[PDB]
Every structure is written in C-alpha cells, then in structure tokens.
Amino acid sequence: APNVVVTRLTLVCESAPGPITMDLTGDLEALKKETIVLKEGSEYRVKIHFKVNRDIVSGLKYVQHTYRTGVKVDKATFMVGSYGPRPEEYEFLTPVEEAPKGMLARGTYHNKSFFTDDDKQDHLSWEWNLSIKKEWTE
C-alpha cells in the first residue's frame, strides 16, 4: 500500500440539498460517467480526503484543472503541506469560492485533479465532471 492514499473528493456547499461526493478508490474511468451538480452562484469548497500510512510527507499540493469545450484551461494550485501517519484520514479544504452564474455559466465542466507534492509524486490523478445548473434539480 502506498504511503499517501487519496480516498474521496467532496464539494462542501452548505446550501446543497444533499451530499456532493465521490469515492476516489474505485475505477477512475468510471468516475467520469458520474457528474456532480452545483447550483450557479453557490459558495463551495473543494475537500480532499486522504490517508498517510507510514511516513511523514511534506510539500503536498492539490492541482485542479478545469476545461470547457473549446476554451483554455482554468488552473489552480493549493498548498496542502506536511502530514504524519495516522489511522484516520485527513481532510484538506480549499478557501471558499463562488461558482459562476448566469445563462452563459451553465453547463458541464471537465476537471482533471492532481494530488501531488514538491517531489512531483503522483499520489492520485483523476478526471471528474461538474455541472452548473440554474437550480439544484434540472
């Protein structure tokens, strides 16, 4: 088993009608068929769940690349830091952002996420889709 195991991504959104989360331990190809819904203008944070198994790690980084068909990438990088080994998993949260809003903000966004570090180690890379909608349901 690897030292760092990434287990879950959660969109923390207080106004959401239900949990917005994905299991990151399964078929990664299957992850794309799953789409994740955010009402336009919602305040959210991205929460990455991960386990450290054996050794202290340093320089952890979360890298998130968002694509819309035909548009240059929208990239962000987040310092995660140093973590020691323990049975319970850790939770890193980005700062709050506001999802975009308006008719032109609606649609599906294709994300590729990297959990890595300053040693460029690929702790997990995965694609997932996000859908911005006028309301939470349709």
Ligand X SMILES: O=C(CNC(=O)[C@@H]1CCNC1)N[C@H](c1ccc(-c2ccccc2)cc1)c1cccs1
75 near ligand X, judged by CB under 6 A: no
Least gap, CB of 26 to ligand X (angstroms): 20
Query: Largest alpha-carbon pair distance within the chain?
Result: 48
Which element (helix H / strand E) includes 4? strand 4-12
74 near ligand X, judged by CB under 6 A: yes
Type of residue at 59: G
For residue 56, which of 85, 91, 29 has the smallest C-alpha distance?
85
Number of residues that bind ligand X (CB under 6 A): 13
92 near ligand X, judged by CB under 6 A: no
100 near ligand X, judged by CB under 6 A: yes
Within 22-41, the residues that bind ligand X by CB under 6 A are 38
The two structure tokens encoding residue 33: 């068929």
113 near ligand X, judged by CB under 6 A: no
* Nearest-angstrom CA–CA distance, 115 and 64: 9
The contact set with ligand X (CB under 6 A) reads: 38, 44, 66, 68, 71, 74, 97-100, 109, 111, 130
